[PDB]
Design a protein around this ligand. Structure first.
Ligand SMILES: [Zn+2]
Ligand SMILES: [Zn+2]
Length: 71
């Protein structure tokens, strides 16, 4: 069979992964505005988000793109 380590168990095919955490759906999450983004899902605590931002939101993995982005 298979033992169920009490301490800490590794990932599982139970559910698909989205956020970099490489974990299943959990906690507060958001949807990346970028239509190209494959994940389009990240955890708040991870995306330094305290509340649900109104309008559009771009993950910290897309916005940081090498382009004409000047400031
Ligand atoms: Zn995460
Ligand atoms: Zn994104």
């Amino acid at each position: 069979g298979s033992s169920g380590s009490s301490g800490d168990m590794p990932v599982d095919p139970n559910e698909p992964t989205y956020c970099l955490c490489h974990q299943v759906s959990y906690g507060e999450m958001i949807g990346c505005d970028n239509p190209d983004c494959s994940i389009e899902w990240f955890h708040f605590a991870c995306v330094g988000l305290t509340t649900k931002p109104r309008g559009k939101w771009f993950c910290p993995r897309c916005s940081q793109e090498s382009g004409p982005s000047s400031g």
